[PDB]
């Protein structure tokens, strides 16, 4: 699996199930096929949207660039509402830059328009770790309080990952 | 420390480990620290204040030292709070 | 002393997105852009001083106006229809600039009022057969969020993690 | 892009009435705001403390027409007093946008039509003062039930009714 | 923020099936639709906490209201006469939609109150020669069951023995 | 489709027949008119749902009211004396109509509350030397039956042996 | 002394449900008061005529959750309607206190958990009014048996137990 | 003729002793404090006038309330646990004062509701994501007696020997 | 007429913009009307499916979803007509 081979298994009580969602990339940011599919969906949605904008006169106002930015915003908003990105708001989801401040007239004369997009694709759950303690009879609440305080503080100030990885 | 257990695992799935003692670091604010001026034969950090995480770390870095008892008492009384 | 010279009340361009179709029309007037905290009263018990507790954010209604002119027929027929579709929303785009005439000089991103519902549509403010004012198209929108996206300045950023 | 066609003026609209089965020939020189109002409710998604507004319960607010009270308005008064007495009778308001310099209106597009209007108010005389010099104004308040347009190449108030 | 706008209070259409008669009249108001459980208190003997035990399901009375208009004579007669036939009962159909004006866009089936008995028929809520409100025709119904069958949502699937 | 208007609250005229007297005074107000069913609860044994069984029909008390004016002494005496005769009954005639001033359009017959007994006669609702409201004659009646015969709609046909 | 920490607001809680074996992701925007109530008996010590109060028969009063009725609530309706049909099935209520501004919840402490709750009332539609503008209100009444909290550091509710 | 402006509704500070715990949190609100007398009717036989006979003294339930803030978990647990111990009691201390801001000037002792039992604990009066009011911790108490011991002015002195 | 509204039912055009002075001099006035007449039910088709015990609700959900989606996409008529 770390080498990019996705296995198919015959699990009792489940049937035939794919137990892998990794790509062949060595890039840690596109490890999962879900991220690749999300990026492809964004790109193809935008391309199909802009197909109607191709071969449109660039009038004096250059309002077509602002219209393109508007269309990009609405398209990506619906992708956020579908749920492809991570966060709690569109501001944490995606950002767009397609105004005339990024368009060079020399390229416009040739018919070139540049648009810049940033997105935060959603992630997945691959392996789930259960770290469970066995307490004595009576000290459950005290042990929970202490351990929970420690864990929450470490995560809050970023020292949770600070530590060796077992085996 | 209780978060990296699943890092060196390739197969997907649910796995179980034991909940160990997780260290809770201190926030940096005045008078959360104690500076012990002592001597160790191995001059690893000669005249250089070095943070110590516990008595085991103190022994590993400095080995023998007459301040080992003081270090142990400090850690026992501080219970993970404060820095040495 | 004074250098950058501040923004004028006319220093913004207002645009609309109505459902899935992009409007090319501009609006010559927009009301205040605000984030209001509905406030609650409480006491700590140590004093008779009245304390105020913020809560229940809301972005108040925004009234846009422009000159009623031919070509606003689609604008009307779509502002009428936005609310009929529970998926459709109105998005407001405000670009701050420093225009002289038609020489706008945009700087920073554009403030975006997202997920706005139509509360009122008034193609004709009034009729006076011997009046001389310009007919005023008006539209009231209830926004649900504010952000800023398209530039090097984030004019608005809601609190988020990190 | 630029200003090619001048916008409508406040005087660019001619107002006419239909009172039951009567096609009134008189014109109205003042009409109030034309609106579609959405009565709004408040709600939350539970994921935030932001107040969301929910439209509903459409209503077209009252429209007040005014004109100069002149002889020949007696039939108009007697019709407006009597419209409501007949449960079948309705008042229809016809607003034609034009571009009139003097009496040279240039109609373009269809006519906005306020259909199924009830009379809420009829004021033949706004006031009396033997020292006053203003023209007496005949006013009428109408509660409309619908808006459309059918009179020309440009339709101004197409409802999304068409499924 | 939000995606699908929630149903408004005006987002339902109400119809009646009175015995063997299908009524085309629409009702403007309806009371709340519930499934209540009567409750009994008990204890497990191991503690002094009062535990609640559901039982004796009841669907509470539902009050429909509309504007009393001509053509409601047959509705009045049918509602008055329905209980005289032990076989006859009233069915209530409530379809959720997103009405703009006359532009309902329904999705899902419809909530059907099945086997309802009339408990009150009030053609006239009151009379006042100075009043201005529309006369209200009210009807109280006691339903026995709720289901839903005419669409693709099915929002009242009661529990059933699913083999 | 707004065609025939609905009846308004002011769209009815109320008259009384007190014993053998055909009283000509019109009443300004009346309470609700229904056919109430008393109910019992039961079960079919095959489920735990509570089913409702109608029974013991009743027509609830109707409170008529009007402005207390001279010439009402006759009405007061008649309503005070009607119950003294076991044969005497009070009949209530309600004619719906599309009212506009003194113009009306009566359509259909008239609801008739038949065999009503007087339960309360209040010539004066209250006295207040500083008050300004019109004194109100009130009369509470307990009807036994409801029918309709005056016209061409007959909208209270009780079930009969057809 | 001086308010270092602003107190919780009425909007500072997030409410979630566990219906039987189902984990509902829907959030509720309203909840009634959370209490531990003691039923009291009157007594006297015999040395005075003062009436003394004796606690006993603890009860956690009914909790009414409410939210906006929107599509995707059909599963919630069915689950709430069917939960009481299984004697092993219960409803759990999770209330996480937080310090949210918009969508920026700041949860500190654990969550108050109403454990072993039975449904007493399910009202998908609080009212229907074709002229109203309020949002349709889903309501659900629950009878909890016990309250605890397990998640974050702060244990809000801890019932007295053996030391 | 008025010299001392009278006590206001805001002129009291409320504190709790929960069992063996001296809770330092101050409460913002409290209900009425009385010594109510239940009554029986009688007659002296020589007239038809109904005479009232006092008896069965009672101190009606008192509802304290405050703003629900962090650090109140200790208070919640203490008030939830106090009734579990038959020896444990809740004491309410009310100090009258004339506070301008934080400048309370107490005069007299403090009224003490002694031997109070918890009848109701409501950490959250209600929840509403659109609401803006401060969440209210409420606690209902049933006192058995009232006295006062601190400063010069004794406020409550029951008839002793 | 067919339609929930007049704007669905009918439309008129008879103003002066459609009148020609030459025809008016002869006494001619032109009016243009459009209407959508109501239709009738001629044949009613019952498509009823027989279901095993228990699976009625699931079968109904599946079939209703398919039928509604087809109708709203307009694919319902795209096919061959059976006799």
Numbering used by the authors:
A (entry chain A): 339 to 505
B (entry chain F): 2 to 85
C (entry chain Y), F (entry chain T): 2 to 163
D (entry chain Z), G (entry chain X): 1 to 163
E (entry chain S): 2 to 164
H (entry chain W): 2 to 162
I (entry chain B): 423 to 505
From the publication, what sentences describe this entry?
Besides the baseplate, the 1045-Å-long tail of A-1(L) is composed of one tube initiator/hexameric gp18, one sheath initiator/hexameric gp30, the tube and sheath that consist of helically stacked 24 rings of hexameric gp10 and gp9 in two layers, respectively, surrounding the tape measure protein (TMP) gp13, in addition to one terminator/hexameric gp8, from the distal to proximal of the neck. Encircling the TMP, the tube forms a six-start helix structure with a helical rise of 36.2 Å and a twist of 36.2°. Each tube subunit adopts a conserved structure, containing a β-barrel domain and an α helix, in addition to a β-hairpin that protrudes towards the next ring to mediate the inter-ring interaction, thus extending the tube. Notably, stacking of two rings of the tube is also maintained by the complementary electrostatic potential. The domain II (residues Ala364-Ser460) of one sheath subunit stabilizes the N-tail (residues Met1-Ile27) of one subunit and the C-tail (residues Thr461-Val505) of adjacent subunit in the succeeding ring, enabling the extension of sheath. Meanwhile, the helix α10 of sheath domain II lies on the concave surface of tube β-barrel domain, further stabilizing the interface between the tube and sheath. However, TMP was proposed to adopt a six-fold helical bundle structure in Myoviridae cyanophage Pam3, which is consistent with our observation for the majority of A-1(L) TMP.
PCC 7120. Using cryo-electron microscopy (cryo-EM), we solved the structure of A-1(L) tail machine, which consists of three parts: a 205-Å-long neck, a 1045-Å-long contractile tail with a complicated baseplate, and six pairs of tail fibers. The dodecameric gp2 portal, the pentadecameric gp5 and the hexameric gp7 sequentially constitute the neck of A-1(L), to which five neck fibers are attached. The long and contractile tail of A-1(L) contains 24 rings of gp10 hexamers that form the tube, surrounded by the sheath of 24 helically stacked gp9 hexamers.
